[PDB]
Amino acid sequence: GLFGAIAGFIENGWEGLIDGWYGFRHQNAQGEGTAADYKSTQSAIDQITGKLNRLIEKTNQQFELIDNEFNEVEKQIGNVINWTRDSITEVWSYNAELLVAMENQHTIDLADSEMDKLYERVKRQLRENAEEDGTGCFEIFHKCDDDCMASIRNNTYDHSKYREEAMQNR
Amino acid sequence: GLFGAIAGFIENGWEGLIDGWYGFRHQNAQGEGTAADYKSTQSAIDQITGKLNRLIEKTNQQFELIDNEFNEVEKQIGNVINWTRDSITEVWSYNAELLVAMENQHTIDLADSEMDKLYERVKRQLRENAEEDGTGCFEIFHKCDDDCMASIRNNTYDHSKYREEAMQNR
Amino acid sequence: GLFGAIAGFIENGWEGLIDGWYGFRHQNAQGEGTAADYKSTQSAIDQITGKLNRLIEKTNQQFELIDNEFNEVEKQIGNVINWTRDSITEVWSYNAELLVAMENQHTIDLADSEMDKLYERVKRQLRENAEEDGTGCFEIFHKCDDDCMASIRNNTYDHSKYREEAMQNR
Amino acid sequence: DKICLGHHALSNGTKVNTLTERGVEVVNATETVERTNIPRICSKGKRTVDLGQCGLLGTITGPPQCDQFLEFSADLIIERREGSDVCYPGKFVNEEALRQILRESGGIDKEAMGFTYSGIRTNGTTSACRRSGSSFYAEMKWLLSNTDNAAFPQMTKSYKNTRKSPALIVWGIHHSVSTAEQTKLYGSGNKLVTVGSSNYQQSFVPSPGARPQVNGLSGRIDFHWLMLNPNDTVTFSFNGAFIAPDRASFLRGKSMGIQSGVQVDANCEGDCYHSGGTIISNLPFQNIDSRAVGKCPRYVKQRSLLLATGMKNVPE
Amino acid sequence: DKICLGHHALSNGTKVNTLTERGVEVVNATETVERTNIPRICSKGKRTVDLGQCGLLGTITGPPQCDQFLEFSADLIIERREGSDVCYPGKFVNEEALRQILRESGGIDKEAMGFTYSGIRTNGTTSACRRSGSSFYAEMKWLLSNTDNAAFPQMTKSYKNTRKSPALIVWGIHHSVSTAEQTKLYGSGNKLVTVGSSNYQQSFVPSPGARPQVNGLSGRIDFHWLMLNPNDTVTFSFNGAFIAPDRASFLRGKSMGIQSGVQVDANCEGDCYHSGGTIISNLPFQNIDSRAVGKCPRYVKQRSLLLATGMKNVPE
Amino acid sequence: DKICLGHHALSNGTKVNTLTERGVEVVNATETVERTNIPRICSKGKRTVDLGQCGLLGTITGPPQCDQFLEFSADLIIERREGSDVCYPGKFVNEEALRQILRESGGIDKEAMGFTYSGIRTNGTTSACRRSGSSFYAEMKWLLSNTDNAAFPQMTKSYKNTRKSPALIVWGIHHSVSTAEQTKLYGSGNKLVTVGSSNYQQSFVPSPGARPQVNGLSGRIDFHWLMLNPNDTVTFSFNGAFIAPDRASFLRGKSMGIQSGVQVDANCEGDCYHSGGTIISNLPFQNIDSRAVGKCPRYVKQRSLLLATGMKNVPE
Ligand SMILES: CC(=O)N[C@@H]1[C@@H](O)[C@H](O[C@@H]2O[C@H](CO[C@]3(C(=O)O)C[C@H](O)[C@@H](NC(C)=O)[C@H]([C@H](O)[C@H](O)CO)O3)[C@H](O)[C@H](O)[C@H]2O)[C@@H](CO)O[C@H]1O
Ligand SMILES: CC(=O)N[C@@H]1[C@@H](O)[C@H](O[C@@H]2O[C@H](CO[C@]3(C(=O)O)C[C@H](O)[C@@H](NC(C)=O)[C@H]([C@H](O)[C@H](O)CO)O3)[C@H](O)[C@H](O)[C@H]2O)[C@@H](CO)O[C@H]1O
Ligand SMILES: CC(=O)N[C@@H]1[C@@H](O)[C@H](O[C@@H]2O[C@H](CO[C@]3(C(=O)O)C[C@H](O)[C@@H](NC(C)=O)[C@H]([C@H](O)[C@H](O)CO)O3)[C@H](O)[C@H](O)[C@H]2O)[C@@H](CO)O[C@H]1O
Ligand SMILES: *[C@@H]1O[C@H](CO)[C@@H](O[C@@H]2O[C@H](CO)[C@@H](O)[C@H](O)[C@H]2NC(C)=O)[C@H](O)[C@H]1NC(C)=O
Ligand SMILES: *[C@@H]1O[C@H](CO)[C@@H](O[C@@H]2O[C@H](CO)[C@@H](O)[C@H](O)[C@H]2NC(C)=O)[C@H](O)[C@H]1NC(C)=O
Ligand SMILES: *[C@@H]1O[C@H](CO)[C@@H](O[C@@H]2O[C@H](CO)[C@@H](O)[C@H](O)[C@H]2NC(C)=O)[C@H](O)[C@H]1NC(C)=O
Ligand SMILES: *[C@@H]1O[C@H](CO)[C@@H](O)[C@H](O)[C@H]1NC(C)=O
Ligand SMILES: *[C@@H]1O[C@H](CO)[C@@H](O)[C@H](O)[C@H]1NC(C)=O
Ligand SMILES: *[C@@H]1O[C@H](CO)[C@@H](O)[C@H](O)[C@H]1NC(C)=O
Ligand SMILES: *[C@@H]1O[C@H](CO)[C@@H](O)[C@H](O)[C@H]1NC(C)=O
Ligand SMILES: *[C@@H]1O[C@H](CO)[C@@H](O)[C@H](O)[C@H]1NC(C)=O
Ligand SMILES: *[C@@H]1O[C@H](CO)[C@@H](O)[C@H](O)[C@H]1NC(C)=O
Ligand SMILES: *[C@@H]1O[C@H](CO)[C@@H](O)[C@H](O)[C@H]1NC(C)=O
Ligand SMILES: *[C@@H]1O[C@H](CO)[C@@H](O)[C@H](O)[C@H]1NC(C)=O
Ligand SMILES: *[C@@H]1O[C@H](CO)[C@@H](O)[C@H](O)[C@H]1NC(C)=O
Ligand SMILES: *[C@H]1O[C@H](CO)[C@@H](O)[C@H](O)[C@H]1NC(C)=O
Ligand SMILES: *[C@H]1O[C@H](CO)[C@@H](O)[C@H](O)[C@H]1NC(C)=O
Ligand SMILES: *[C@H]1O[C@H](CO)[C@@H](O)[C@H](O)[C@H]1NC(C)=O
């Protein structure tokens, strides 16, 4: 994708993450744990389902028969009709192929985007108390227990409380 | 948007900012002030008006009457004509809906993009003499008077002059 | 572009860089040197050539004559035919213009994107041992010889080896 | 010591196409092209008329197989392969245009023309039209000369449409098996039938001669028609060889007409129909039949076009 | 202590649609679909011919209401509902094709055919064509038999197009009220008119009989036509019942033809026209009339499609 | 002290268009609209039939210039401006429809109808059809009356299509120069030719009269046709003025037909053709000819539409 996180600086996805699309997997003194990020999962899902509601509709435009399967119409008019129908088929076949391709490109980039936005959000919370690993991980210098991880996941992590510790640990 | 600034890490817009699209609102010892960023406002405006000049044109392609409102043409040819016109209407109605939707998506992302580019520009100027708040604010450790703010707004802020001060203030 | 690197925070391109699309130009005690980044060059080239393989195809849909250049058909049917053909020409002329324009926008943004991804990759490697200049340059505080530059270019630069030096040099 | 961001993934993804790439795997994807047919005509909630052995144009003239269809009413009209417009061998001039008018008519209402005849026979029948013995088209009258070889006198008959909608008028021209048998039925000489309306001018001289035996008979009847506007008058000057209208048809409203060889089904609803059945789908495209009618997904040549509904799949 | 980045916003935005969402509010938006009609035909700078009571096809044959239109010249031709192509009741065979030719002709230039007649009458008139008393189509001649019941002798008359562009040739066939009155005008027997050109072969026997009274008369004239190429010759063999061309029409250049029931206006300019008026707009789409002609925005079914011209609106 | 990132650039770029901008310069770009014509018909690997002086419809009736084309076979059929469908001046009714049928026929196979004649002449010829002296259409027979002014007796002849594909049947109607010369050839009276098939009903009375001299002759032959289905029978009742079919045509398979005035070339291959030649290209669009046929790029009005294949060019 255009934002270089999915199939980018993050090596791969997690098959264990069945809770949501995006998540945190932490490592500390109390072991290892994993949890989904609701907010980002939801932004992606909503935007995608929004694409669907737009495309999954049929028009109220009625078309009637202009030729006959049981009793062939005059050849000249029949050939004009077939030519016209074939031309229209060529137009819609093109439109459908382009629509789906450009939608799929945008879907993939948008998903990649949401991951990046989540990644950056966490960086801004952890200001100065952490560093960029480079694989989608934040090395935390101060002691961060499970309670501390939960504060990160839920937008309540006060950096100033631990700032002195992690600063010194530089 | 895809860049996560507008309706993203920035909480909301400013109704007081009538000068331009994007701007700086600062806070210091001398109080509070606000001003527009010309360069970013202009990149967005130019790119948007460029979309418009492309779409707001009509073709030089002339079409003539093939049927008659006062004196109905023969029914068979009349039905082929109506079917053909209705098919074309279906094509253009689709094209117009898709064009506007994909343009609007791109406009919104592009506006979000320019805000992000402006945000990053300032970060690079302020290297090491400031930190990311996380709401679209740079906390400046050294003393930055109105004269100092103007240097930031106008690409003349020499970070090395204040580096020693703000570094110590870590 | 949307990512603000090409014709953005990087001032301009390099006419000397004939090796690839993107590259590193370094400066140190041993002088100055330049080299292409294969990986990013290749991502851009592959994605672009992928656009081409999609567009450079013609359909297997055969169309036959419905009118006559040597012996004009009846005027009424002839005018319906011309009107129908002209309508289709109007559709494809529109489609072609939009396709190329939206492809070109995406190509330019994608190229800008790859440059940004490369820029960020290097930043993550150099964590704490360097700073953002703001023109697309990393000022390295510790001594980095040509051997050291090659380690950066090839994803083998161990930051922890030089960390103590560059940290002190803050 | 650390906290890591990631995303979900599967062992196997679903391949889809993008602007840049063919067959990139994503977490989930859905089909945009309908391939599922229902092999029935889904007519739940619709006034439906299945013509079976009655041809659509037969509803206007009335051969025996169309007796129960002379004044039908419908939202949906179904023509069948076994349908026949005629009993006595013949065809309609400008047939397909008339079919199109009738397919969307919403059915027909009939009204007496009020023609009275003097000095001629009106009772002409045949073995091709069977209603317990010989008969004729229910809405028509086979006008003959009083006795064999007798002169068919130059006649004038007129009809004014005194209603608010166009009247459909139909008349036949009989082409006998020989020049002799034309004289037997209608007397000798050059038989000329003329028809004139404000929108319309035409004339009809017959043409006796040997056709191949259809329904056992070598004669033909040419059916003709026009749409007579409100307050307009139509006049019939004829010298013989004329199959006169008894009733006129008026159109009830709106309908859709289809051709099909599958059964009707009042348990499923659908608005998109083709000869093999009904396409029920909200998908924007279909690859079932390019001649589908009603309110349909757009026909496209591709079997399948998958739309990504998930991120790119990057497995372990 | 701090410096903050932000963007502008309003209390209320303008709702628009995207790929992902319906009704997202943005700072500013503009309409891409034209809904504003001008209820006049905007003809500023254009040679305009408003036919009024003259029917377009009447300009070729010349009934009294088309006398001032026999050699007109135009960029823009306007047909009106009150127009009539005929004085003496009748119609043109292949009428709509001829209209299309004439709508874009740029008008017509006329030239004498140079037919001379001997042994017949050429002065035939009627009360339907009024030019202070009885008259006839200005560009035609009603050819009659010298006296009542007199033989109309088998005639040959020819005309060579000696010009660089196609000639438009028109002739009429008279269908009298009775078989008697055909004999009165042109003598008895089977009247046969034949016409032959390098592109063209056809024949015409008339058909007398009673039509309803139009303009007080029950007779009809069938007008027919062909396009005679440069250096090509056309021959008229006729035995009566023939309305002969006096002049031939040549096409001046290029025009556009429209139908409308609104006034002409030389104060506004426009290139897109419909019967209710003119669409003046640079917008790429219109929802006013799908049958609009000229150089138009594309007709679409949606009333409105707003295009964002500002960022997303995120209010306080 | 430092390491810098950058990208490549040129002094001069290639201008292209985007959604936002006109003429942005990029590093590299390629054309999406084909402008290169090959001024030959590229027929490598295709069974090709260049008709030259033979008109396509002449292959069915057989004037001298079509003698080598009576049973041709082809994937690609080429009509030329110099082509002529006739020797004896005349034309086909419904000509263009027949051309379309023949263009994609894959050629024709011929078979004897098996008509036997008694009490009439079958040897009728002319100086217009030259095969070392006077001749006639190879696949037809000019049916005449035994001697001058002799009655042409009312005849019946029938033909059953006993094959698995539709038969193409063609017959002519002779229109003599005068009413006299019609009587000379076929006797006096009203000549009536009738034709009847399960799909088909029509009749033909001729029309003698003076046409202009084409090929030195003022007579015309009207050629007519129908498609006779498998197991169906067609009957010909005629009283004279009839050009009878000797053979019937069957369609071999599939072909494409084109019109062109350039040479054939078996060294280049192509699937998209127009009168000026062949468009060989993989580009999705072409601006050469909107009436190009075969498998073609889409015709568009723009000369050129460049597609960026490189990043934006930002020079020093
Ligand atoms: C009654 C009489 O004088 N002769 C009878 C023969 O005609 C009859 O031969 C059969 O004729 C059949 C055709 O008969 C009809 C028909 O269409 O069924 C009978 C209709 O009454 C007559 N209708 C009118 C209005 O004239 C109709 C009409 O003449 C023609 O259809 C018009 O072309 O003909 C049929 O051809 C049989 O194949 C043929 O054998 C014999 C048979 O038993 O009986 C005679 O009494
Ligand atoms: C003059 C004469 O001998 N008889 C007069 C009656 O004919 C006339 O009856 C009226 O006839 C009207 C039709 O008259 C015309 C016409 O079209 O106006 C007169 C034209 O000169 C004649 N033109 C030619 C070339 O023959 C024309 C033509 O015969 C027919 O239109 C062709 O169908 O007829 C009309 O029908 C009136 O309604 C009818 O009363 C009476 C009336 O006063 O006067 C007699 O002197
Ligand atoms: C043989 C005879 O009695 N008289 C000869 C004149 O007819 C002839 O005058 C020339 O006639 C030419 C037309 O001749 C044909 C033709 O088409 O070439 C001859 C055909 O055999 C005849 N075919 C049939 C089946 O009848 C054909 C036919 O009558 C008409 O084409 C039908 O319209 O006519 C041509 O018109 C010449 O321009 C004309 O001079 C003279 C000439 O030397 O010789 C007489 O012996
Ligand atoms: C127009 O196209 C239709 C098909 O869409 C042609 O009809 C088919 O013809 C083939 C071969 O002739 C048959 O096998 C099919 O049964 C037909 N299908 C249908 C739905 O009718 C038709 O021949 C074409 N028209 C002309 C004039 O060629
Ligand atoms: C083709 O469509 C036109 C409309 O675009 C039909 O004409 C309209 O018919 C309705 C009802 O019959 C009238 O109320 C309108 O006045 C007509 N509008 C116009 C612009 O003519 C027309 O009937 C259709 N053709 C056929 C053969 O049905
Ligand atoms: C339909 O369009 C064709 C062109 O695509 C017209 O034919 C051209 O006519 C012009 C002027 O009449 C000639 O100079 C060209 O030689 C023609 N080109 C071709 C390819 O035939 C044609 O006239 C139009 N049809 C009608 C009925 O007007
Ligand atoms: C992965 O492979 C198996 C092989 O049997 C296949 O059945 C399955 O559908 C694949 N998974 C997905 C999600 O397509
Ligand atoms: C995957 O997409 C399908 C649409 O075909 C949908 O029914 C389903 O909800 C989706 N499943 C998951 C696990 O996301
Ligand atoms: C038809 O004419 C009658 C007069 O008898 C009148 O009542 C009716 O309104 C007219 N209708 C139309 C459509 O002209
Ligand atoms: C917001 O609300 C008012 C209510 O009267 C409405 O009139 C106004 O148009 C709205 N503002 C915008 C910019 O649409
Ligand atoms: C908003 O857009 C309209 C187009 O409808 C334009 O006239 C105007 O310049 C714009 N106004 C502002 C304040 O941006
Ligand atoms: C028509 O023929 C004449 C010979 O009299 C000649 O001058 C003229 O150029 C010809 N025009 C064409 C188009 O053949
Ligand atoms: C730049 O300018 C020269 C002027 O001669 C021109 O020929 C050349 O094509 C240009 N370069 C490119 C890459 O277009
Ligand atoms: C530039 O694009 C052209 C396509 O027109 C291609 O042939 C060539 O490989 C490209 N050249 C370079 C130097 O990238
Ligand atoms: C035509 O009829 C014959 C019977 O003689 C039969 O063999 C053949 O199968 C029939 N073909 C069709 C298509 O009906
Ligand atoms: C039909 O009517 C006539 C009376 O004009 C009568 O003579 C004849 O017998 C009738 N025919 C039949 C079969 O009832
Ligand atoms: C018309 O012309 C003829 C001369 O052939 C003449 O006898 C007759 O009186 C003329 N008619 C009129 C009304 O002047
Ligand atoms: C053509 O055939 C007839 C026999 O019916 C014969 O008399 C005549 O001479 C033949 N004509 C020619 C030119 O051989």
Instruction: Spell out the domains of chain A, with CATH numbers in brackets.
Output: 1-170 (3.90.20.10)
Q: b/e for A60-73, b at 16 or more Cβ within 10 A?
A: eeebbbbbeeebeb
User: Which single residue is written with the structure tokens 């694989």?
Assistant: A135
F57 and F115 co-located in one domain: yes
Contact between F96 and A74 using a beta-carbon 8 Å cutoff: no
D116 and D204 co-located in one domain: yes
F41 and F143 co-located in one domain: no
Query: Which ligand approaches the C-alpha of residue E104 most closely?
Result: 6
Alpha carbon nearest to ligand 4 atom 15, residue: A69
From E262, E280, E308, the end of a domain falls on E262
D222 and D78 co-located in one domain: yes
What number of other Cβ atoms are within 10 A of residue E49's Cβ? 22
Residues of chain B with Cβ-Cβ distance to D98 below 8 Å are: 75
The residues, ordered by sequence, that sit 6+ positions from E158 with a Cβ below 8 Å of its Cβ are: E233, E234, E235, E236, F212
Q: How far apart are CA E71 and CA E249, in angstroms?
A: 9
Contact between E101 and C76 using a beta-carbon 8 Å cutoff: no
DSSP F230-270: TT-EEEEEESSSEEEESEEEEE-S--EEEE-SS-EESSSB-
Q: How far apart are CA F194 and CA C53, in angstroms?
A: 60
Tell me whether strands D29-31 and D306-308 are parallel, antiparallel or unpaired. Answer: antiparallel
- What the block records as the tokens of E72 is 């007109």
Classify F8 in phi/psi space as left (phi over 0), alpha (psi -120 to 50) or beta: beta
Query: Which ligand approaches the C-alpha of residue E16 most closely?
Result: 10
E94 and E156 co-located in one domain: yes
Q: Under a CB-based contact definition with an 8 Å cutoff, are residues B112 and B2 in contact?
A: yes
Contact between F158 and D208 using a beta-carbon 8 Å cutoff: no
Q: How far apart are CA E139 and CA E225, in angstroms?
A: 14
E311 and E278 co-located in one domain: yes
CATH of the domain at F175: 3.90.209.20
* Residue from the list A59, A106, A127 with its beta carbon closest to the beta carbon of B90: A59
DSSP E116-185: ---SEEEEE-EEEEESSSEE--TTEEEEEESSTT-----EEEEEE--SSSPEEEEEEEEE-SSHHHHHHH
What phi and psi values does residue F82 have, to the nearest 5 degrees? Answer: -70, -10
Q: How far apart are CA B10 and CA D28, in angstroms?
A: 32
Q: Under a CB-based contact definition with an 8 Å cutoff, are residues E268 and E36 in contact?
A: no
Q: How far apart are CA E285 and CA B59, in angstroms?
A: 11
Alpha helix ranges (H) inside chain D: 58-61, 95-103, 179-186
Q: How far apart are CA D303 and CA D281, in angstroms?
A: 15
- What the block records as the tokens of E233 is 């010759």
For a ligand 13 pocket test, name from F8, F10, F11, F12 the mutation site with the most ligand atoms within 8 angstroms of its C-beta. Answer: F12
D12 lines ligand 7 (CB under 6 A): yes
Please, what is the Cα angle at E143 between E140 and E148, to 5 degrees?
Answer: 150
F162 lines ligand 15 (CB under 6 A): no
Query: In which domain, by residue range, is D268 found?
Result: 1-46+263-316
Q: How far apart are CA D201 and CA D62, in angstroms?
A: 26
Position in ligand 17 atom list of the atom nearest CA E146? 5
Q: What burial class does residue C144 get, using C-beta atoms within 10 Å of its C-beta: 0-12 exposed, 13-18 middle, 19+ buried?
A: buried
Position in ligand 17 atom list of the atom nearest CA E125? 13
What residue ranges line ligand 11, CB within 6 angstroms? E 28, 30, 309
Q: b/e for E246-276, b at 16 or more Cβ within 10 A?
A: bbbbbbbeebbbbbbebeebeeeebbbbbbb
Task: Give A139's Cβ-side CA count (13 Å radius).
Answer: 12
What phi and psi values does residue E136 have, to the nearest 5 degrees? Answer: -155, 170
Q: Under a CB-based contact definition with an 8 Å cutoff, are residues C126 and A131 in contact?
A: no
E88 and E118 co-located in one domain: yes
E83 and E31 co-located in one domain: no
E74 and E207 co-located in one domain: yes
Q: How far apart are CA F105 and CA F99, in angstroms?
A: 10
Q: Under a CB-based contact definition with an 8 Å cutoff, are residues E20 and E47 in contact?
A: no
Q: How far apart are CA A154 and CA E30, in angstroms?
A: 41
Maximum Cα interatomic distance, chain D, rounded to a whole number of Å:
119
**Domains held by chain E: number:** 2
Q: How far apart are CA D298 and CA D292, in angstroms?
A: 9
F72 and F180 co-located in one domain: yes
Position in ligand 6 atom list of the atom nearest CA C81? 1
Q: How far apart are CA E294 and CA F96, in angstroms?
A: 30
Tell me whether strands B137-140 and E2-7 are parallel, antiparallel or unpaired. Answer: antiparallel
Query: With an 8 Å Cβ cutoff, is E6 touching chain B?
Result: yes
**Amino acid letter, residue D115:** F
Q: Under a CB-based contact definition with an 8 Å cutoff, are residues A167 and B170 in contact?
A: yes
E27 and E111 co-located in one domain: no
Alpha helix ranges (H) inside C56-145: 75-125
Q: How far apart are CA C85 and CA C67, in angstroms?
A: 11
C-alpha dist (Å) from residue E186 to D193, E219, E241, E242:
21, 15, 7, 9
- What the block records as the tokens of B95 is 């094209």
Give me the residues of C, 32-91, that contact B with CB < 8 A. 76-77, 79-80, 83-84, 86-87, 89-91
Position in ligand 17 atom list of the atom nearest CA E121? 5
Bridge partner residues of F195 (DSSP) = F202, F236
What phi and psi values does residue C112 have, to the nearest 5 degrees? Answer: -60, -40
Q: What burial class does residue E36 get, using C-beta atoms within 10 Å of its C-beta: 0-12 exposed, 13-18 middle, 19+ buried?
A: exposed
Q: Is B6 helix (H, G, I), strand (E, B) or coil?
A: helix
Tell me whether strands D33-34 and D285-286 are parallel, antiparallel or unpaired. Answer: parallel
Maximum Cα interatomic distance, chain B, rounded to a whole number of Å:
92
For a ligand 17 pocket test, name from E117, E118, E120, E121 the mutation site with the most ligand atoms within 8 angstroms of its C-beta. Answer: E121
Q: b/e for B85-104, b at 16 or more Cβ within 10 A?
A: bbbbbbbbbbbbbbbbbbbb
Bridge partner residues of E77 (DSSP) = E49, E257
Q: Under a CB-based contact definition with an 8 Å cutoff, are residues F40 and F267 in contact?
A: no
The residues, ordered by sequence, that sit 6+ positions from A156 with a Cβ below 8 Å of its Cβ are: none
Q: Under a CB-based contact definition with an 8 Å cutoff, are residues A74 and B80 in contact?
A: no
CATH of the domain at F10: 2.10.77.10
Q: Which helix (H) or strand (E) holds F31?
A: strand F29-31
Residues of chain A with Cβ-Cβ distance to C3 below 8 Å are: 2
3-class SS letters over A76-126: HHHHHHHHHHHHHHHHHHHHHHHHHHHHHHHHHHHHHHHHHHHHHHHHHHC
F242 and F166 co-located in one domain: yes
- What the block records as the tokens of F105 is 């026929």
Among E285, E287, E256, E254, residue whose Cα is nearest residue E273: E256
Q: How far apart are CA D49 and CA D75, in angstroms?
A: 8
Q: How far apart are CA D3 and CA A143, in angstroms?
A: 12
- What the block records as the tokens of E114 is 């140079």
